[PDB]
Amino acid sequence: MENFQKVEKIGEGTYGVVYKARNKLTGEVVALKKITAIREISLLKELNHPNIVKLLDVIHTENKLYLVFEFLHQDLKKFMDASALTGIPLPLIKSYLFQLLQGLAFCHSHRVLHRDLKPQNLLINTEGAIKLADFGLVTLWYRAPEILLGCKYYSTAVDIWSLGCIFAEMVTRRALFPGDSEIDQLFRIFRTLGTPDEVVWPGVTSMPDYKPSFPKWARQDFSKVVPPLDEDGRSLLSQMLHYDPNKRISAKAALAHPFFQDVTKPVPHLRL
Ligand SMILES: O=C(N[C@H]1CCCNC1)c1n[nH]cc1NC(=O)c1c(F)cccc1F
Known part of the structure; x- marks a missing residue:
């Protein structure tokens, strides 16, 4: 140009x-x-x-x-890799999560979905700011289950799901659901959160790619999933990872969550 x-x-x-x-x-x-x-x-x-x-x-x-x-x-994927030996400090994790929730609350209010949130499209500066990039208009690891199950008219809830996955990853320093195909992604989710059914996700069995032949896993204990995250953080995360898109917490409600009562804006240490 x-x-x-x-x-x-x-x-x-x-x-x-x-x-x-x-x-x-x-x-x-x-x-x-x-x-x-x-x-x-x-x-x-x-x-x-x-x-x-x-x-x-x-x-x-x-x-x-x-x-x-x-x-x-900088982007969050590189920053996570660089922070693997020590881990991102919690107050920095908390600040980044709050900021991204503000960004999504804004998008969502304007009926704009991101659709493809992942660490590599989350950009960071020396100021302590984090920003949403590559607005959709480690491929699968952040995909919401309703997308994987073939829903064509999915909602803003898909971005909440992705951000919960990212939140878990900052905390543990390992990807939550590192699937390498669509069925592997789905089954990794099922293994952790339990195979969904009509009890927890009304209408799930009528989704396009839902199969009655899916194996039936029991859901694990979040305490097992994201230690040593505190009970406020775990409770927020579990609401961001609700199977039912209509029960999943919105960005705006998530900003009111007790987890953020003591939120601050620390600066990261970057190597430019
Ligand atoms: O990639 C960017 N910065 C990189 C700097 C080196 C470390 N890495 C981050 C970047 N800066 N501003 C915008 C931007 N990238 C994007 O908007 C972007 C993206 F993050 C992912 C896909 C497409 C795209 F355009």
């Missing part, structure tokens, strides 16, 4: 490639993603929040689509 100088590749994946880049007249350092679509993308331009990576610009040209974003230096 005429107006941009590529610095380095910082991101790849499914649809686009992401570079760190430098604008030629503003001097701005940016993340440049190279790829109905155009109308929904432009709506993202107005979805502005301190916990949403900020879309600076959209350049549609020569059958390429460039999305220009504010640049952040």
Whole structure:
């Protein structure tokens, strides 16, 4: 793109490639993603929040689509890997979870879903801020069960599920449900939370990919799942991981949870 100088590749994946880049007249350092679509993308331009990576610009040209974003230096996956020996301190975990809940409460109120939350698209700065990136418009590990079961009209609850999975992972320093196929993801969830049935998830047995032949596992003790998380954190997590999307806690209610009574905003130690 005429107006941009590529610095380095910082991101790849499914649809686009992401570079760190430098604008030629503003001097701005940016993340440049190279790829109905155009109308929904432009709506993202107005979805502005301190916990949403900020879309600076959209350049549609020569059958390429460039999305220009504010640049952040670190992402949560790399930060987790870097923190594996010690673990992220709880008050930092708690601050990041609260911030992301604020971000989602905002999206959700505007009827925008993320759909694909994972540590690698959660960006962090030296300020202690954490931001939602790559708004959907370790692949499966964060997928809500109603998606895996073939629901086509899934809700904002799917983002809560993903964020609960991420919360558990910060705490334990291991992925909660590291499935390597859709059936492995589903069965790993069932093994931990119990095979769902009509008791805990009314309508589950009428989902498109639900099979009566699914094995029937009993649900484990959360105390076994996320030690040494405290009872406030465990209780919040269990509400974020409810099978029934209609029972799962909303972002806005989760912000009121007692877990956040003593929330603060620590700064992480980053290696730039
Ligand atoms: O990738 C980014 N920063 C990287 C810096 C090096 C460590 N790693 C983080 C980034 N900064 N600002 C936006 C941005 N990336 C995205 O918006 C993004 C994403 F995170 C995932 C998929 C597509 C995409 F465009």
